[PDB]
Amino acid sequence: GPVVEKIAELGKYTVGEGPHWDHETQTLYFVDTVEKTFHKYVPSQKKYTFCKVDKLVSFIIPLAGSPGRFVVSLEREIAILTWDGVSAAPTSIEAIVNVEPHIKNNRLNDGKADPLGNLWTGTMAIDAGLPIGPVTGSLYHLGADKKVKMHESNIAIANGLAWSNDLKKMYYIDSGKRRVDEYDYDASTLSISNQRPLFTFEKHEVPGYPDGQTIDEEGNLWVAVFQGQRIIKISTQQPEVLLDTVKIPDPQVTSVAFGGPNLDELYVTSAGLQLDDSSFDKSLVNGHVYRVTGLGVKGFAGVKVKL
Template sequence: MAPTIERVVENIELGEGPHWDAATQTLYFVDIFSKTINKYDPSTNTHTKAHFDTYTSFIIPVEGKEDTFVVGLGRDIVIVKWDGRSDKVASIKKLTEVDNYSPESTENRLNDGKCDLSGRLWAGTMGVEKINGHVKPNMGTFYSFENNSLRKHFDQIGISNGLAWSKDNKKLFYIDSPRRTIDQFDFDIENGKISNRKILFSLEKNHIEGLPDGMTIDENGNLWVAVFNGFKILKIDSTIPETLLDTVKIPAKQVTSVAWGGPNLDELYVTTAKFMVDGLVLNPPEHGTVYKISGLGTKGLPMSNFKLT
């Protein structure tokens, strides 16, 4: 039986960073260009958002603290208090600032971010995008943050993007979009270290158009990768290099990220965008929509929240 795809939130400029919160059974995500954090409650089919003065990049609940989130805000990692209903947050507390090493780097911004099983935050940056779709190359850096301490892992990144961990927490999968590859690292969760970077899958080698963007992993160890400018999601075997298992077509051109959700984690939420690049207009409702896909025959792993120490 073919999967079922439906629109659940519409009119999003640049949807990104979907995070399913199992405790509240709700989906959080950001709209980067609209400078908002968003909440979608499938039980009531309601969508709410709060506005900021600069670009948002991710929103992740803080473990054990109600209505509290770690958010990427420009180049800052902050803690916000938000009731999930108001159009403004109650408070913002800055934890740290990234990419402050030169006047040029201060034009950067944070992009995708996720937490590992220990509650440690991983996030990277990208160069300035003064014209939509044209990012200053090789300006980004990849970081982790825990115990109020920021650690730099590597730089020379085009657009820091998708993150996922293997079920046994021995591998970190990572995407720098302009490289058009899904890479893997050996992952040391105890010490928060990564090493031995290798290419797992190359869109170039497999003759796939578009850029790899956000991604997630299922319980069987398969990666699901959003393809920006590709109208699709790729299902990739994370254990055998260059192994494409399936392709799921999406009605939107700019597919940005994916996250497993629902009571059984068997529904795939897909964020998309509709911003103009080089004069190409993408019209709603197909573009700039959050989709929910059911019937994919697998389910995901629970997403980890941020542990504030």
């Protein structure tokens, strides 16, 4: 089957997350959502660097047309970070907008640009919990004149996002619902409607919780399963179709991104954070980064945020 390789040079992460593959520089960026640090990995040169800040972070995406600048989350703020990619702190930080100025215990979580370059991101309680905890998150996109628009609320744990190739569908994961939802996506108005379940974990005996996701060129979704020790491949052509399962040694798989020179290697982040309600003993929970080859599919390069 597919070959799953632990990336030794990268070490262990508390909650590694938000992988972004920059295809022109052949570079993987990612975050640790509890340790307040950004990470850069260049596989062809075996080069690893990091950057520390003093706010919780959850995504890092290159700014379109601005080498050396990134759009990031800092607690509840969307900001532009200027970073040379090697120094241990940012050169400067430019705040764009605070998405929830008066919800003091919320944070931004997963964020991703749609194929047109619009940033989408969701919030959640800092003390959110599974299976039950405070439900306080919403789904936003960053639109004209640096103002956000709200598209969904009552989100427990805002997580992975993806869009179909023809720009008619959006896929979204609230981990607390243990399902992947699909929406009709209107690219001209950037609005979503007709929410319905695409894939429900309970119907297929899939353990754990859906976390990050990414779509391949054939339109299949690859979904990280937190507390599932796996990634799964699900159809977008028909509801409730499990196409394949790939086991990952780390139980707490958090996200996925296609990368490599031909976009046919799947990079997989995980969490070493040891939780008190785990289905897995502490010795199993490490937080390594993995590379999966031999999946027989290609993905897309990560999209830069347009501002």
